[PDB]
Amino acid sequence: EFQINEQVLACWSDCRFYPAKVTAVNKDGTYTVKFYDGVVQTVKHIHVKAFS
């Protein structure tokens, strides 16, 4: 699992991945993440990738 303040690739509405910061790790297996533009999204662990 990725941890708070870590960056990941998260999927946006255009079906592309962009870097997002993990702002919360939830016990249900989701993350809250925030894109560079400040847009927040809740996503399942399986739907984010490592950002390197």
Added chain:
Amino acid sequence: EFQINEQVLACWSDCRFYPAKVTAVNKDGTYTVKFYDGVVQTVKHIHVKAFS
């Protein structure tokens, strides 16, 4: 623009496209669409593709 009851490809949380039925065309340039499994989503016109 796609019309009601037409099928399109719409993006889901796994960053893949799947066929969805248009159930409403909104004046703000979005569609309500429904995937085969009955999951409903509102999406911008620019974020769906033709399904053929």
